[PDB]
Amino acid sequence: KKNYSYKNIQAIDFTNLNDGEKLLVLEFRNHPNTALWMYSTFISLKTHLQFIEDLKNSPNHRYFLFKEEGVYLGVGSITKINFFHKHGYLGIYKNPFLKNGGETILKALEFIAFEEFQLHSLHLEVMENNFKAIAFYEKNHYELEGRLKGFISKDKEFIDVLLYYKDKKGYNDQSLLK
Amino acid sequence: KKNYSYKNIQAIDFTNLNDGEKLLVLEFRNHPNTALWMYSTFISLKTHLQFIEDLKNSPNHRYFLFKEEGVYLGVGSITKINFFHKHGYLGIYKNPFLKNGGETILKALEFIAFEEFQLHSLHLEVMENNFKAIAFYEKNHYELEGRLKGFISKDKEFIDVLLYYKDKKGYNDQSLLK
Ligand SMILES: CC(=O)SCCNC(=O)CCNC(=O)[C@H](O)C(C)(C)COP(=O)(O)OP(=O)(O)OC[C@H]1O[C@@H](n2cnc3c(N)ncnc32)[C@H](O)[C@@H]1OP(=O)(O)O
Ligand SMILES: CC(=O)SCCNC(=O)CCNC(=O)[C@H](O)C(C)(C)COP(=O)(O)OP(=O)(O)OC[C@H]1O[C@@H](n2cnc3c(N)ncnc32)[C@H](O)[C@@H]1OP(=O)(O)O
């Protein structure tokens, strides 16, 4: 339950958020630009505060608020971590008031996952209609590995979740080639 | 947190297990024939008892001990349930001292998932080297939808998890054709 540093980027564990930061995360999370692409649309403050409390005893779920030179970039998570099998799932939503930031969050987040946690593989669940996220991860060398068919209810139809992954060798190859 | 009935089969929620049944489940679970195919190999009694306690406040995770005319058939679960999106994951291990039983557990379990819970889809994670389980689900009309690549550590190598699913229409088609 500690923070991390990558370049001039800080990853603030959710369990170390000051009270302003707790509300900022909630604002980021409930914004239409974020919520539309989440499994649940709206998080009450009560739910949010409880979630953060529960994270204190949930070492397999790590949420970070990313900050860089005074700017809050957005949120990244590494979840359903398993340390024997060395896998985890990645999640990101950027500050909805900023034009970019996702790339920076991803780089720091992958540093944490592959170097600090020494994970072997990272997996992604992304809604099949989330074209901006799909393109984003494909550009970052994430590779398609399947679907969860009809996993999501959207506008009264069931649509798919897409599954992507990156392993440690892939991560290494990116870094060897600067 | 209630039990269910399907034909002459009882599904006993883990939160309603008598103390003998709690130890029987643990015996089923830690047996080499079960454990070899689980994400974790060995569950201590302490962990087990805590797990059952936590299930009392975990409506999205349902574990059942199946019994039929005095015979304990094994365990089935419907987990990571989401009631807006109407999905869940299925899991089974039979009484390792019996030659069959999986089929019976599956039928009752699918009844619970699709009729009682009214889920739209059920998903499976199965280790790629688990040939007996693979054949079993394929025979029961589960359909391949992808992989979690290198998800599992086995004998110091990383192997894959296979993803399968069945939806409500598939379930219906089976039942229409008796
Ligand atoms: C596995 C999962 O995490 S699934 C859930 C994914 N999360 C979400 O969908 C939440 C909503 N979306 C986001 O948080 C983000 O858009 C992410 C994390 C998906 C991607 O991060 P982004 O910063 O948006 O990366 P992206 O490549 O799409 O940025 C757009 C680029 O074009 C510009 N741009 C900004 N907005 C847009 C836009 N709507 N359309 C096209 N270009 C845009 C930007 O300037 C940026 O380029 P630059 O940094 O060089 O200046
Ligand atoms: C998504 C998930 O749940 S993944 C984890 C799956 N669970 C496990 O791997 C735990 C260990 N294995 C099991 O629990 C079970 O074997 C299951 C649930 C996978 C399948 O249930 P089973 O009862 O074994 O079904 P299966 O079709 O393989 O039964 C074997 C059949 O051939 C006979 N048979 C019994 N043992 C064997 C055996 N080792 N090999 C071949 N045939 C056998 C049986 O008589 C049975 O037929 P019958 O009921 O008509 O008499």
Author numbering:
A (entry chain A), B (entry chain A): 2 to 179
Question: Which passages does the manuscript contain on this structure?
Answer:
Persistent infection requires functional flagella that are heavily glycosylated with 5,7-diacetamido-3,5,7,9-tetradeoxy-L-glycero-L-manno-nonulosonic acid (pseudaminic acid). Pseudaminic acid biosynthesis protein H (PseH) catalyzes the third step in its biosynthetic pathway, producing UDP-2,4-diacetamido-2,4,6-trideoxy-β-L-altropyranose. It belongs to the GCN5-related N-acetyltransferase (GNAT) superfamily. Mutation in the pseH gene of the closely related species Campylobacter jejuni resulted in a non-motile phenotype that lacked flagella filaments and hook structures, indicating that PseH plays an essential role in flagella assembly.
Here, we report the crystal structure of the H. pylori PseH complex with AcCoA solved at 2.3 Å resolution, which allowed us to address the molecular details of substrate binding and catalysis of this enzyme. The structure of recombinant H. pylori PseH (residues 1–180 plus an additional GIDPFT fragment (cloning artifact)) was determined to 2.3 Å resolution by using the multiple isomorphous replacement coupled with anomalous scattering (MIRAS) method with two mercury derivatives. The asymmetric unit contains three molecules. When subjected to gel filtration, the protein eluted as a single peak with an apparent molecular weight of approximately 36 kDa, indicating that PseH behaves as a dimer in solution. The PseH structure has a central twisted seven-stranded β-sheet flanked by five α-helices. Strands β4 and β5 are splayed apart, creating a channel through the molecule which is a signature of the GNAT fold. Analysis of the difference Fourier map revealed an AcCoA binding site between the splayed strands β4 and β5, which is the common cofactor site of GNAT superfamily enzymes. The carbonyl group of the thioester forms a bifurcated hydrogen bond with the main-chain amide of Ile93 (strand β4) and the hydroxyl of Tyr138, the putative general acid catalyst in the reaction. Our structural analysis suggests that there are no residues in the vicinity of the AcCoA acetyl group that could serve as an acetyl acceptor and, thus, it is unlikely that the reaction proceeds through an enzyme-acetyl intermediate. Notably, the 6’-methyl group of the altrose points into a hydrophobic pocket formed by the side-chains of Met39, Tyr40, Met129 and the apolar portion of the β-mercaptoethylamine moiety of AcCoA, which dictates preference to the methyl over the hydroxyl group and thus to contributes to substrate specificity of PseH.
